[PDB]
C-alpha cells in the first residue's frame, strides 16, 4: 500500500519569503522560512490522496503552534502560542483537495532556539482526525526577535587581580554587542610579579534551564582568542579586537517564558609558566540587530 493521503503545506509568499538556517545535533543544518513577530501566516494545505479508496475522517484542522520543549521530554512541552483554523467538518475524502488558511497578525514573542536541554520552535501542524490514529503533519518555521540600538550602552571597565602579585585594568568598549559586532578593548598591566606565558579572551555561552532550585546550567566555550604572547611588564597595554561574526552566536535570551536563559560571557584568561590559570568572567548581552 503506502499512505492513503499525504499532507503538504504551501505558503502564499513561498517564492519571495526569506529562509534561514538552524544548527542541530551532530552538526546538521536545517533550513526553514523566516518569520517575525506580528506577521500574518497564510497559505494552502494541499492534500494529495494516493490510493483509489476513501478516507473517512472526524475533521481536518490546521494549527499555528509555538512551544518550548525541555530535556527532550514530551511531558515537559509547553505551548506558549496555539491558534486553530478548522478546515473541514467530519466526512469523507475521495479525491485531492486544497484548503486555504490565514492566521491574522500572529504574535511571536520569542526567537527560535535549539540547545542542549531546550528547544524553542514554531510550526504549522495539520491534523486529519481519524477513529484510532490521526494523520499529522508538522511544518517548522523560524522566528527572529529584533532589537534597535540600546539607549544605555556603557563600556565595561574593571581593575582586578591577585594581591601583591598581579593587578590589571581591563576595558571592553560596550556591555551590549550585536551578533556581527566587534569586541574592541584593551588590557592594561599595573602590577606584574608573576611570569605570564600568554593571555586569551574567551566567549562562553551558558544555557540555564529550570525553575528555582531545579537549575541545570550547560556551558560551552565558543571561542578561545589569543591576545598576548609572552610576559608583559607594568605600564604595558595590550589591544583587543575580536570579531563576533566569525563564531555564529545566538542572542542573549533572558528568562524566556520563565523556563530558560541563554547568556554570554567574556572570560579573560592569563596563564603562567607552570600552567596556572587566572581569569575574570564578565557578562555581555548579545542582540540581533535589525537591518534597515
Amino acid at each position: 500500500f503506502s499512505t492513503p493521503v499525504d499532507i503538504d503545506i504551501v505558503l502564499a509568499d513561498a517564492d519571495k519569503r526569506a529562509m534561514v538556517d538552524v544548527k542541530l545535533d551532530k552538526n546538521r543544518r536545517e533550513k526553514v522560512p523566516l518569520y517575525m513577530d506580528g506577521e500574518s501566516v497564510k497559505g494552502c494545505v494541499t492534500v494529495r490522496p494516493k490510493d483509489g479508496k476513501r478516507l473517512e475522517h472526524t475533521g481536518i484542522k490546521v494549527q499555528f503552534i509555538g512551544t518550548i520543549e525541555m530535556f527532550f521530554d514530551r511531558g515537559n512541552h509547553y505551548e506558549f502560542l496555539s491558534l486553530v483554523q478548522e478546515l473541514a467538518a467530519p466526512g469523507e475524502l475521495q479525491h485531492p483537495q486544497t484548503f486555504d488558511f490565514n492566521f491574522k497578525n500572529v504574535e511571536k514573542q520569542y526567537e527560535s532556539y535549539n540547545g542542549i536541554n531546550v528547544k524553542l520552535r514554531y510550526f504549522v501542524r495539520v491534523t486529519v482526525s481519524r477513529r484510532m490514529a490521526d494523520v499529522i503533519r508538522e511544518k517548522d518555521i523560524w522566528v527572529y526577535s529584533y532589537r534597535i540600538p540600546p539607549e544605555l550602552n556603557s563600556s565595561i571597565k574593571m581593575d582586578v587581580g591577585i594581591e601583591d602579585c598581579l593587578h590589571i585594568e581591563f576595558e571592553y568598549s560596550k556591555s551590549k554587542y550585536h551578533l556581527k559586532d566587534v569586541i574592541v578593548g584593551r588590557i592594561y598591566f599595573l602590577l606584574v610579579r608573576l611570569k605570564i606565558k600568554h593571555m586569551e579572551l574567551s566567549i562562553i555561552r551558558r544555557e540555564t534551564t529550570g525553575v528555582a532550585p531545579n537549575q541545570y546550567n550547560e556551558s560551552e566555550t565558543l571561542v578561545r582568542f589569543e591576545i598576548m604572547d609572552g610576559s608583559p611588564s607594568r605600564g604595558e597595554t595590550i589591544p583587543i579586537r575580536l570579531f563576533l561574526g566569525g563564531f555564529d552566536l545566538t542572542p542573549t535570551f533572558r528568562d524566556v517564558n520563565k523556563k530558560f536563559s541563554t547568556r554570554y560571557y567574556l572570560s579573560l584568561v592569563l596563564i603562567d609558566e607552570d600552567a596556572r590559570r587566572y581569569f575574570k568572567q564578565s557578562e555581555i548581552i548579545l542582540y540581533r540587530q535589525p537591518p534597515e
Binding site: 598581579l166 587566572y278 581569569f279
Partner: peptide, 10 residues
Amino acid sequence: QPELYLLNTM
C-alpha cells in the same frame, strides 16, 4: 588538574 584562580576586584 590545571589550577583556576578568580581575579578579585580592588
